[PDB]
């Protein structure tokens, strides 16, 4: 569940001295650190992060010894991230003028992550090194370091100014040693685990998505009164809402306890009398009158059912169920009961039969006793890795609207000409968002909308962070990358420039 992350960073002089255009690695590492801190702060995953620096003038480590383990500092211990850490990163950290051996820094990181982890459970442990590998060092304690990392099961990561992994020989030696360390720890797959500052910034510029864990819903899929298969249902797709809501506070003291909310009731008399809650009964409207209907009477007459029912009313061809009739605000995914082989076999048989016959199951679904029953459609979904049923609600008789719309093909005044059709065809061809893979295998989606984070939460977190760090300044404008991700690639517009002009020429649109 929780994770402990010891962020170890370089503050040596070699970082400051660099070409101004190159954006010397100190600033890029600082930006990466800050972005990671914001992502962790605004995503409350209950993760612990500590900060270690090497190459600084001061010395504060649990282990000192002699000349070794010097010029290192442990600025932050294992504790939850907070805005104080962001403020400290922004200004309290400045470049130094000394050098240090990053192997000793790794030793100190191991020491802190092993000493401050007692008393807490951590399913994961990480150590990120931020260095340019431009400091002289000696390799004499690598085997013990690898053994300790293997025994403690602690992952490693490296972030360097260059993507490869024009450089000096010392940088090349650093590359060789880090590559050997990565290979020994994991192997071939570990080679790609050496990121660059620019690439990491490309991935850390977006706040983490709102992640919620669905709770399994057990039930029994029933076909008649003799066949029953144990099943578990999860919520696959639903509209996501902010976990936290705004709190009303008084303008001056800024406290929630100094404001109260309550409701009262009155009559139509001029005196504006008041009545108590218990003296109020619910009623309904029947035409031009009001029919009293007490809550107790409603419960007595209420439609009573038996909860937790997943019954197969029948089987119907897939063509008879249209996507436009889907109801509800959720999609359910039904698997076999966990650790149940017979249920898995039965569900697999049903799914395969439905897929082979091209059929879907019209079923009755009720969440619990006090949940209104629903009629829905369950259809198969077979994939190499997994197979399961997909349930989506269906409409009742009252939910269908009978609206009449005039025909467009039979119209004599709204019939497009051949040139207009050709222009529209050219526009559609130019603005295609799917490209064939050299007309060989399949299609590729140029603008996949399922991988775009919701801009609403991004904007909310951006504004909250800006207010936290700058209490006085107003809110900023929307970030450019949000607009970039909310728009298609520029190639589409470049291709569509001319067809749009042709359509404008051919179609006389006038605003009335």
């Amino acid at each position: 569940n929780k994770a402990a992350v010891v962020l170890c960073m370089d503050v040596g002089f070699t970082m400051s001295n660099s070409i101004p255009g190159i954006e010397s690695p100190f600033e890029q590492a600082k930006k990466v650190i800050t972005m990671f801190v914001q992502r962790q702060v605004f995503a409350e995953n209950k993760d612990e992060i500590a900060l270690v620096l090497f190459g600084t003038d001061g010395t504060d480590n649990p282990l000192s010894g002699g000349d070794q383990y010097q010029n290192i500092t442990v600025h932050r211990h294992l504790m939850l991230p907070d805005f104080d850490l962001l403020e400290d990163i922004e200004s309290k950290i400045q470049p130094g003028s000394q050098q240090a051996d990053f192997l000793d820094a790794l030793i100190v990181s191991m020491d802190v992550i092993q000493h401050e982890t007692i008393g807490k459970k951590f399913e994961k442990r990480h150590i990120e090194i931020f260095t340019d590998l431009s400091s002289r060092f000696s390799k004499s304690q690598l085997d013990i370091i690898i053994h300790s990392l293997k025994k403690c099961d602690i992952s490693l990561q490296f972030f360097l100014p260059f993507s490869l992994g024009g450089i000096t020989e010392q940088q090349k030696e650093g590359l060789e040693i880090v590559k050997m360390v990565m290979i020994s720890l994991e192997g071939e797959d570990g080679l790609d685990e050496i990121y660059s500052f620019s690439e990491s910034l490309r991935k850390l510029c977006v706040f983490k998505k709102i992640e919620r864990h669905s709770i399994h819903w057990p039930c029994r899929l029933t076909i008649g009164s003799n066949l029953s298969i144990r099943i578990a249902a999860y919520k696959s797709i639903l509209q996501e809402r902010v976990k936290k809501t705004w709190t009303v506070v008084d303008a001056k003291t800024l406290k929630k306890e100094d404001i109260q909310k309550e409701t009262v009731y009155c009559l139509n008399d001029d005196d504006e009398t008041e009545v108590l809650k218990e003296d109020i009964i619910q009623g309904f409207r029947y035409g031009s009158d009001i029919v009293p209907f007490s809550k107790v009477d409603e419960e007595q007459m209420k439609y009573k059912s038996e909860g937790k029912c997943f019954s197969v009313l029948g089987f119907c061809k897939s063509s008879q169920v249209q996507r436009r009739f889907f109801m509800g605000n959720q999609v359910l995914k039904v698997f076999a009961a966990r650790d149940d082989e017979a249920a898995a076999v039965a569900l697999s048989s049903l799914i395969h039969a439905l897929d082979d016959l091209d059929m879907v199951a019209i079923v009755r679904y009720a969440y619990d006793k006090r949940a209104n029953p629903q009629v829905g459609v369950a259809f198969p979904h077979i994939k190499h890795n997994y197979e399961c049923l997909v349930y989506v609600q269906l409409p009742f008789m009252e939910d269908l609207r009978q609206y009449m719309f005039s025909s467009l093909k039979n119209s004599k005044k709204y019939a497009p000409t051949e040139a207009q059709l050709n222009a529209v065809d050219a526009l559609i061809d130019s603005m295609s968002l799917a490209k064939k893979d050299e007309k060989t295998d399949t299609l590729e989606d140029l603008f996949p909308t399922t991988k775009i984070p919701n801009p609403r939460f991004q904007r909310l977190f951006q504004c909250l962070l800006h207010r936290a760090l700058h209490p006085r300044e107003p809110l900023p404008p929307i970030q450019q990358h949000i607009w970039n991700m909310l728009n298609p690639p520029a190639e589409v517009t470049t291709k569509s420039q001319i067809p749009l002009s042709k359509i404008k020429t051919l179609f006389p649109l006038i605003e009335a």
């Binding site: 009313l313 029948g314 019209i362 008789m397 269908l400 009978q402």
Partner: peptide
């Protein structure tokens, strides 16, 4: 117009719901 409800003019009459009728 064919299939027009007498009770509510302008709305096509809705067939009564028969439920499930096995073939």
């Amino acid at each position: 117009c064919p299939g027009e409800s007498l009770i509510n003019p302008g709305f096509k009459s809705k067939k009564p719901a028969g439920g499930v009728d096995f073939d």
